[PDB]
Each structure stands twice: as C-alpha cells, then as structure tokens.
Structure 1
C-alpha cells in the first residue's frame, strides 16, 4: 500500500491569551486598588480617582462606584466616584 511522503508546515505557533479588557463596569462598587481595565496602551484613560500602572492597567484610588465617560476626541475615561 503506497504511502506518499508529506512535507510540513512552518507555522503552528501562537502565544498565550492575555485576558485583557475591562474588569469592573459602570455602576459596580470597587475598593481602592481594584483593577478596572486591563489594556494595551490607553484604550481607556484614567479619570477621577483612577491611577494607571506601568502596563496601562487602570485601578481605583478610592472606594466607590465606577463610572465611564466618552469624551469624544478627548478619549474614553474611567472614573471612580466616592461613596
């Protein structure tokens, strides 16, 4: 039974998924330190009471409630409103 030799593919690699995206949505109660957005670059921008880490991670500075705001050409911001 003839078996024809086969070549091979030079591909077949992919990197681990990074689980990026928003982690707390508008209206959710968060605690200072809570991660709000995992992102590459400033897809969202830190607004009121929100810090930004070296990898653009947005995180809450105070206990409170998350709020989003789309400022058009100024960009999308994530806020934390004090309780």
Structure 2
C-alpha cells in the first residue's frame, strides 16, 4: 500500500552520436538489452554495452531484416 521507493537512474542512452570520431575502446551506447545492435567494428559487452573495437566515426545504420538499428564504425 504505502509508496516511496525509486532507484538510482542508471544514466543510460547514446553516448557518441552519429558522426563522431571514436577511439578503440570508447563506450558507444549504454543499453538495457540491445536497442542498438553491434555493427562493423563495435563490440557488445556483458550488459549489452556497445563499445568500439577500432577507430573511425559512428554510423548508426538501420540495416537488414528484423528492422534492427546498428551502430557501426566506419574507418574514415
């Protein structure tokens, strides 16, 4: 019945938007279960964190079947 109780608001979402230069370890998307999928040179960590495996710029392409949003890094 009685009612308080929130939690500490985990700061999720898109870091490193769609034209930005990335280094080879940077967190792309903090994610709660794959909104965005792992593209060309990006990694998919344990808690579905997208991180960069190479350098370049972020792409954010909507590719393929299943309508999936991909974060990929184009070496440019």
Q: TM-score, normalised by structure 1?
A: 0.84
Match of 2:42 in 1: 50
Unaligned runs of 5+ in 2: none
Match of 2:20 in 1: 28
Match of 1:73 in 2: 66
Alpha-carbon deviation of 1:15? 0.3
Q: Mark the structure with the bigger radius of gyration.
A: 1
Match of 2:55 in 1: 63
Alpha-carbon deviation of 1:44? 0.3
Number of residue-to-residue matches in the alignment: 75
RMSD: 1.3
Q: TM-score, normalised by structure 2?
A: 0.91
Unaligned runs of 5+ in 1: 1-8
| Aligned counterpart for 1:40 among listed residues 7, 29, 32 | 32
